[PDB]
């Protein structure tokens, strides 16, 4: 049996993520839900679906947030995977960093052997904060902390398939980070002939900036909610199936480089199974333009990591 | 009443075609002479193969129920390249009377060129069981049930070669090419002076992938007598897979041109038989980057 | 003399009992009567059933 | 290929329904989205998913609603299925009646051969109104109008499977209507032994009262929106597969009884095909207790139909 | 719908192929079976399966083989795809060539527009023979004649996967021909780190001698028949799906190069669509060892094309 | 990890069963093959398919069979499920009864906790022999012995779906035995209106006689072989998934009635779980004609059981 817990299940991302995760989880598994407001309502109506072999649990926190909430302490016993999607919709960084710290501290104090998947933004700065918190507790494991950066691959695949038609590829490698100039799509590594460099330039720029055109489409009133939910659900299913012994997939994730690279954290290919990360793989051959892009990407990612650790250090 | 005799001659054509749908060719010049057989038997030796067939054909108008006429017609029409048009004549020769061993051998050969295994073995068996001295996995029956009675017919009467010819035909149809050649070799040892078995020796070597052997046999065959367009066709086939296409095409065309040497060359209906030979011209002449020529290959008038 | 042959040929060709048959048969018949190529033309012409001389000859 | 249009795609149910429908539709389909507010942002969000072979279209209406909207007129050309899921979150009927009438009138004047699936809540009363609207135009086809009621079956299956575990059944037949006393599940028609009659009565009451269970947990702030999205998507996929010639499924829907029942509209089993409804089936044998409940259900649904048809005529 | 015909269905390969096709074909399609011995028994056996929406049909051939069999002339009406798998259980070529000429002549005269898939060995020589037979009657279409070479791709993928485990790729490109020296696996075009050259060339050698390995294990009494059936069914499903418009896949097959390579026939990547091949793709970059291997293979492939297109039988 | 062994894998039925099983087995499982002749050839054939995560093993026995083959005592270690499908093509009963008991005695002395699925042809009499054999050594577990009877249900479903159209049903209950007059289909227990009794009893007769239909079609040269492979593979997959904890299916099989029926062995519905049979279900309501059929079937089933037990008691 696997027990999967969604933290922040009543939000805009969380509702769709829970709905998608309920439909795909294997027979005999459990789903745990938590939030500070609205958890009972979402847990009531997901429990009316006729899917057999699945158990649904829930907990609710005190509406004015309380650090180390006992309700979350009781729900976190026996969990295998944690999905942290509790972000509030540098004030954003200040607000979200403390939430991530508190939630990881509460969850890792009762089930230290679980896997942590971090969806709340900005990933580049929040993954090092979770690492610092876990090291403070004394239960850090480099092979079980993951940052989810699969939406950029989805966008890159969509745009290149729209360009070359009919010629479909199932995925595109993406390396670097998960924000603007730090995203580097490697189109030279996909099968088949490619369009002119002048159009690949525009496609790459579109990939790096795609997050802003959805905000502009909504007239500044919101952001993407459905594509992030789908990316999170797919990555969670990869982790679950690998952990049950039913696969050994190869994925791209923002992880600890462990001396494989000069940058402490980077998005890179890995193969995981049965214990988390199994092997971390080299990036591979790249052209001159991609090398130039990756230089600047790494230069910025180092600063993001530094700021995250600077914030983390100040809290005892 | 000048028309009176033309009328009856026209009736004789369709009155016998109905009972045997052999497409007797209109525009035949022997049909108004008095003794076509006597000159047809001479034309077969001194002159072109292809214009004795019309004389033997004209005999059948004056005289149905004459076995020699269909025997000769069916034999010579397959010494030319018209096999499909010979089968239906030998069948009528049998229908007249089944006892003739000279007809069953021509059926035994003419069916292997069209892969009719059942008919081939039926006729090959009856050939032997017609003579009064042979009394009583490809296929677990129906094959060794025949070859075992041939192996009962060689401890005696050891050296008549028309029997080794039957063994050769039997082994050819079961793709035993590497031992059919010696059977025909023994036959050719015992009677050397007829082309009709040199051709069958060469044809087995060609299929055994020994095309450098076959050409000598064909030049024996086309030296005992000219006009034997079967061996000219076989020479073209042998050159084709020796990769000498520029020479194969010029053997093909002297096959095709010789097959139709008569004045007022052709009528109708028989041409479907020749349309099997042009395809070997097209198949070679569509190597060697020949444009704008495969279109005429599709109709007539050579090169 | 020949005129008898030519006239007989014409009255032969101008009859429905014979028209529908192929010309190639009728040429081969007519040849047997002493009518040569030249005279076969004379006959097809006078009947109004022209055929080229070379096509008779060939 | 098929073209499926979702009307009211930016609501709480519409967004989840569109998300599920994008992942399920066959290769080579089209998805169209319309709403008075928010459609462009939803379309931009969904267009970044890496699903190949599907095209996404959108149109936006006037912020203050306008009858016979010119944009909806242009989006309606070439559509094969209309999913009507617009509705304000007996005013709850008197407001949605005008919306349904206007939407159906606008859509049917452009492509009268499409199927219409009504998901707006007062199903017992809104399905007749659509029928009278189509009749007023002269394009009514009784085999191409369906009301969606699969959520009752989902709830009944879920509740029965929990009591007989590990014995599992894939579906439960439900007939009658779609609101409170008009819902009748037929548990005598499923295989396997059943619990005592005193437990079946409680289970039957739960199915009829389950709608108010979710509202109570949400403290009056909302209702069920993930379960309804699930039901609508699953029904629309049946319709699509039947139209394309890839199946002939048996379903329960609120349809017009073609003289086969004394009630003009009822929820009953049917078989779908390339032209809509291909055959209507009888309800079958039932117990005495189920018969006495069917009587009351029919009595109520007749009044509901009369109310629905009362002002669909002699107004607008 | 589609109508798919298997020519030679009662042989060792044929009936396993038919069994696999029966359970994979889409709803609402026809399966036709033909053979000179044993067809009625196989048709009776398969028609007892509980597959819904599938209709099974058959025709029995003349017991003593006859050219232009009237039974096959009537079963060939309305067919969309022909799978030619009949063959004997240069001696093998001399008989399989004569079988293939007559089968294609009979089939192509009544349904000229069908697609032809050649499974009879040797494909290097029997695909040009079919091309010439179709040219002779004037109905040749270069976009609808395909030679099946998926089996060595399966072998290559299997052999590389269990050397790098855990590291799984779904496929491996293979080009050239379809027998021994003429097949070239391009391992340089798959993602991930790769073994050293001494091991990699041992792996490459095993792929092209794998046919002898099976026959040696069977003590010379037979060949591989289950693997061929699996490969044939998998290839046929791609063609069926592409014809209906439900996909547009990229595959490797032995096809006519249409002047884009100096060799008249070669194994190459192509894109399939609604009316045959839609796009022919280049081989792409390769290393020097692979370039030498391809140079060696093409010389033999040309010699095989010549043997195929000059076939003629000598009149005894 | 689950290990399933097929005993008699080189036979006509065994080969298709093994091919189908390789395609559907879960990731990370083993497949073991055994036969007296031809095992290594089939093992080599199947090893070349590119299925990832599957291991293939094999063993071969002495050409003249010997009791207690030392190769089968080695291949049998660590097995979870045995598929007993060996058997020569009343002398047939007398030879198959001697084969089955020796095979069972060899396998059960090594791994007594496995499940045994009997596919040998006279099931009604060979399933009790295995029970006596297991009792002799002293490891009989009545919840882990099953006789396969799915083919009758397949045929019954096919014929009724052919009668009614378009109205599809997924399965039909069949009870009684597995031979001719002992087969009893229960058409009164499926949904939907039925045809009139006169044709319904014709369908019932055809279901009982369908075995002799195929033998006539093959002119006495064989029997049905693909249908039995389908049924065996489906049943084995049910057992595997239930055993791994990924399901709890309901099936019809020839099992031991542990006191809830007068006949010691019968075909009846059951629920499968992690330890074999979890629950035994009653037959349920039936009409008078069905009652008369069942009453006659039971009397001859008991004589078959007595015959088998007499043979076993004499031999042991």
> Distance between CA A265 and CA A302 in Å, rounded?
8
Question: Per the structure, how many domains does chain E have?
Answer: 2
> Distance between CA D115 and CA D5 in Å, rounded?
11
Spatial CB neighbours of E140, under 8 Å, sequence gap ≥ 6:
E131, E134
Residues E88 and E169 in one domain: no
The answer to whether E203 contacts chain F (CB < 8 Å) is no
CATH number for B10 = 1.25.40.10
Residues E16 and E68 in one domain: yes
Q: Provide DSSP, E204-268.
A: HHHHHTHHHHHHHHTTTS----HHHHHHHHHHHHHHHHHHHTS---EEEEEEE-TTSSSSSEEEE
Task: Count B/E contacts: CB-CB distance under 8 Å.
Answer: 52
Question: Per the structure, how many domains does chain B have?
Answer: 1
> Distance between CA A83 and CA A9 in Å, rounded?
10
| Tokens read off for A11 | 């939000």
Residues F11 and F119 in one domain: yes
Ordered by where they begin, the domains of chain C are 2-51 (1.10.10.10)
* DSSP state letter for A196: -
Contact across the interface for D27 and E246, Cβ inside 8 Å? yes
Query: In 10 A of CB E255, how many CB atoms?
Result: 23
Across the interface, of D43, D214, D219, the residue whose CB is closest to A45 is D214
> Distance between CA D253 and CA B129 in Å, rounded?
81
Helix H segments across D33-149?
A: 39-46, 70-75, 91-94, 96-108, 123-137
Contact B124, B170 (CB under 8 A): yes
CA distance A218 to chain E (A): 34
Q: After which residues is chain F broken (C to N over 2.5 A)?
A: 89
Q: Is residue B230 part of a domain?
A: no
* Number of alpha helices (DSSP H) and beta strands (DSSP E) in chain A: 9, 11
Q: Is residue B213 part of a domain?
A: no
Numbered residues of the known binding site of F for NAD(+): 8-14, 35, 96, 119-121, 228
Q: Is residue B32 part of a domain?
A: yes
Q: Write down the residue that tokens 């507790």 correspond to.
A: A137
Q: Write down the residue that tokens 């006949």 correspond to.
A: F263
Residues D18 and D76 in one domain: yes
Contact F257, F268 (CB under 8 A): yes
Conformation bin of residue F255: beta by default, left when phi > 0, alpha when psi is -120 to 50: beta
Residues D242 and D162 in one domain: yes
Bond before F43 cis per omega within 30 degrees: no
Partners of residue D277 on adjacent β-strands: D272
Q: Is residue B300 part of a domain?
A: no
The set of catalytic residues of F is: 178
> Distance between CA F19 and CA F22 in Å, rounded?
5
User: What are the chain C neighbours of B28 within 8 Å (beta carbons)?
Assistant: 28
CA distance A28 to chain F (A): 7
Contact F84, F101 (CB under 8 A): no
The three-state DSSP-derived secondary structure of B80-120 is CCCCHHHHHHHHHHHHHCCCCHHHHHHHHHHHHCCCCHHHH
Spatial CB neighbours of A260, under 8 Å, sequence gap ≥ 6:
A268, A280, A282
State how beta strands E3-7 and E29-35 pair.
parallel
Q: What element of type H or E holds D57? A: strand D55-60
* DSSP state letter for A17: H
Query: What is the span of the domain harbouring residue B24?
Result: 1-81
> Distance between CA B135 and CA B124 in Å, rounded?
15
> Distance between CA B277 and CA B252 in Å, rounded?
8
A129-148: burial string, b at 16+ Cβ within 10 Å, e else: bbbbbbebeeebbebbbbbb
Residues F142 and F154 in one domain: no
The set of catalytic residues of A is: 178
Contact across the interface for F168 and D250, Cβ inside 8 Å? yes
Q: Provide DSSP, F61-90.
A: --SS--SS-TTHHHHTTT-SEEEE------
Helix H segments across D3-65?
A: 12-24, 39-46
Across the interface, of E167, E248, E281, the residue whose CB is closest to A192 is E281
The three-state DSSP-derived secondary structure of chain B is CCCHHHHHHHHHHHHHHCCCCCCCCCCCCHHHCCCHHHHHHHHHHHCCHHHCHHHHHHHHHHCCCCHHHHHHHHHHHHHCCCCHHHHHHHHHHHHHCCCCHHHHHHHHHHHHCCCCHHHHHHHHHHHHHCCCCCCCCCCCCCCHHHHHHHCCCCCCCCCCHHHHHHHHHHHHCCCCHHHHHHHHHHHHHHCCCCHHHHHHHHHHHHHCCCHHHHHHHHHHHHHHCCCCHHHHHHHHHHHHHCCCHHHHHHHHHHHHHHCCCCCCCCCCCCHHHHCCCHHHHHHHHCCCCCCCCHHHHCCCCCC
Chains in contact with F, where contact means 3 or more Cβ–Cβ distances below 8 Å, are A, D, E
Residues E103 and E197 in one domain: no
Query: In 10 A of CB E73, how many CB atoms?
Result: 14
Structure-solving method = cryo-EM
CA distance E23 to chain F (A): 10
Classify D104 as helix, strand or coil: helix
Q: Which of D95, D125, D148 is the last residue in one of the domains?
A: D148
The answer to whether A26 contacts chain F (CB < 8 Å) is yes
Residues F211 and F302 in one domain: yes
Q: Provide DSSP, D108-132.
A: HTT-TTSEEEE-SS-HHHHHHHHHH
Do B and F share at least 3 CB pairs under 8 Å? no
For residue E25, the chain D residue with the least C-alpha distance is: D246
Q: What element of type H or E holds A217? A: helix A197-217
> Distance between CA B267 and CA B26 in Å, rounded?
6
Spatial CB neighbours of A43, under 8 Å, sequence gap ≥ 6:
A9, A33, A56, A57, A58, D217
| Tokens read off for A257 | 């480089």
Cα angle for residues A233, E169, E229 (degrees, 5° grid): 110
Cα angle for residues A208, A211, A213 (degrees, 5° grid): 105
Bond before E122 cis per omega within 30 degrees: yes
> Distance between CA D279 and CA D255 in Å, rounded?
12
Closest CA to D278 of D246, D243, D254: D243
Query: In 10 A of CB E260, how many CB atoms?
Result: 11
The three-state DSSP-derived secondary structure of E130-160 is HHHHHHHHCCCCCCCEEECCHHHHHHHHHHH
Spatial CB neighbours of A64, under 8 Å, sequence gap ≥ 6:
none
Q: Which of A114, A148, A182 is the last residue in one of the domains?
A: A148
Residues F139 and F210 in one domain: no
Contact across the interface for E49 and F230, Cβ inside 8 Å? yes
Catalytic residue among E48, E58, E165, E178: E178
> Distance between CA D216 and CA D221 in Å, rounded?
9
Query: In degrees rounded to 5, what are phi and psi of residue D251?
Result: -135, 165
Give the burial class of B159: count Cβ atoms within 10 A of its Cβ; 0-12 exposed, 13-18 middle, 19 or more buried: exposed
Q: Which of E148, E171, E193 is the last residue in one of the domains?
A: E148
Residues A86 and A155 in one domain: no
Contact E264, E256 (CB under 8 A): yes
Angle (deg, nearest 10), helices B67-79 and B36-46: 30
Maximum Cα–Cα distance across chain F: 59
Query: In 10 A of CB F284, how many CB atoms?
Result: 14
> Distance between CA D145 and CA D253 in Å, rounded?
10
Query: What is the span of the domain harbouring residue D108?
Result: 1-148
Q: What element of type H or E holds F145? A: strand F145-147
Across the interface, of F46, F52, F226, the residue whose CB is closest to E15 is F226
Report in angstroms the alpha-carbon separations of F205 from B228, E48, F181, F185, F267: 69, 15, 9, 10, 19
> Distance between CA D248 and CA D255 in Å, rounded?
17
Residues A195 and A77 in one domain: no
Give the burial class of D245: count Cβ atoms within 10 A of its Cβ; 0-12 exposed, 13-18 middle, 19 or more buried: middle
**Residue E178 among the catalytic residues:** yes
Residues D95 and D35 in one domain: yes
């Amino acid at each position: 049996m696997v027990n999967v817990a969604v933290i922040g299940a009543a939000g805009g991302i969380g509702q769709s993520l829970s709905l998608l995760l309920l439909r795909e989880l294997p027979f005999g598994s459990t789903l745990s839900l938590y939030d500070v407001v609205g958890a009972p309502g979402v847990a009531a109506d997901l429990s009316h679906i006729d899917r057999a072999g699945i158990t649904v649990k829930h907990a609710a926190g005190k509406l004015p947030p309380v650090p180390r909430d006992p309700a979350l302490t009781e729900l976190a016993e026996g969990v295998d995977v944690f999905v942290i999607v509790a972000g509030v919709p540098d004030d954003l960084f200040n607000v979200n960093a403390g939430i991530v710290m508190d939630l990881v501290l509460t969850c890792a104090s009762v089930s230290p052997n679980a896997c942590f998947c971090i969806v709340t933004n900005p990933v580049n700065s929040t993954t090092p904060i979770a690492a610092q918190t876990l090291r403070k507790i004394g239960v850090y494991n480099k092979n079980k902390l993951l940052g989810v950066s699969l939406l950029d691959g989805l966008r890159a695949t969509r745009f290149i398939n729209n360009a070359r038609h009919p010629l479909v590829v199932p995925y595109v490698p993406v390396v670097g980070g998960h924000s603007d100039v730090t995203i580097v799509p490697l189109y030279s590594q996909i099968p088949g002939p490619l369009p002119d460099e002048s159009t690949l330039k525009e496609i790459r720029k579109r990939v790096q900036v795609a997050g802003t055109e959805v905000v502009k489409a909504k007239a500044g009133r919101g952001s993407a909610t459905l594509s992030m939910a789908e990316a999170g659900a797919r990555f969670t299913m990869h982790v679950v199936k690998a952990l049950m012994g039913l696969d050994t997939p190869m994925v791209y994730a923002y992880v600890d480089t462990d001396g494989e690279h000069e940058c402490p954290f980077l998005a890179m290919p890995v193969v995981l199974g049965k214990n988390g990360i199994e092997r971390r793989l080299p990036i591979g051959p790249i052209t001159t333009v991609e090398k130039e892009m990756l230089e600047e990407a790494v230069g910025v990612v180092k600063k993001n990591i530094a700021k995250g650790e600077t914030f983390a250090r100040s809290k005892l | 009443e000048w028309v009176r005799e033309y009328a009856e001659a026209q009736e004789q054509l369709q009155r016998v075609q109905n009972e045997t749908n052999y497409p007797f060719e209109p525009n035949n010049p022997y049909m108004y002479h008095d003794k076509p057989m006597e000159e047809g038997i001479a034309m077969l030796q001194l002159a072109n193969m292809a214009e004795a067939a019309l004389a033997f054909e004209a005999v059948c108008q004056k005289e149905p129920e004459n076995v020699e006429a269909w025997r000769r017609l069916g034999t010579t029409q397959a010494e030319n390249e018209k096999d499909c048009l010979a089968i239906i004549a030998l069948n009528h020769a049998r229908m007249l009377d089944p006892k003739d061993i000279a007809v069953h051998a021509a059926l035994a050969v003419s069916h292997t060129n069209e892969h009719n295994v059942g008919a081939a073995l039926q006729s090959l068996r009856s050939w032997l069981l017609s003579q009064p001295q042979y009394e009583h996995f490809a296929a677990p029956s129906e094959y060794r049930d025949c070859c075992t009675l041939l192996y009962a017919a060689v401890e005696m009467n050891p050296n008549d070669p028309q029997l080794h010819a039957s063994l050769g035909v039997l082994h050819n149809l079961s793709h035993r090419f590497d031992e059919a050649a010696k059977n025909f070799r023994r036959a050719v040892e015992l009677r050397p002076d007829d082309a009709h078995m040199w051709n069958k020796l060469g044809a087995t070597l060609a299929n055994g992938n020994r095309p450098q052997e076959a050409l000598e046999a064909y030049n024996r065959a086309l030296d005992i007598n000219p006009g034997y367009v079967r061996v000219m066709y076989n020479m073209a086939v042998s050159y084709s897979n020796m990769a000498q296409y520029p020479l194969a095409a010029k053997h093909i065309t002297r096959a095709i041109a010789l097959q139709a040497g008569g004045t007022n060359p052709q009528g109708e209906g028989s041409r479907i038989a020749t349309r099997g030979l042009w395809d070997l011209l097209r198949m070679t002449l569509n190597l060697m980057d020949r444009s704008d020529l495969v279109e005429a290959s599709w109709q007539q008038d050579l090169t | 003399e020949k005129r008898k042959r030519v006239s007989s040929a014409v009255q032969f060709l101008h009859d429905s009992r014979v028209k529908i048959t192929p010309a190639a048969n009728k040429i081969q018949f007519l040849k047997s009567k002493g009518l040569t190529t030249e005279e076969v033309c004379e006959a097809f012409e006078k009947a109004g059933q022209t055929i080229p001389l070379d096509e008779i000859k060939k």
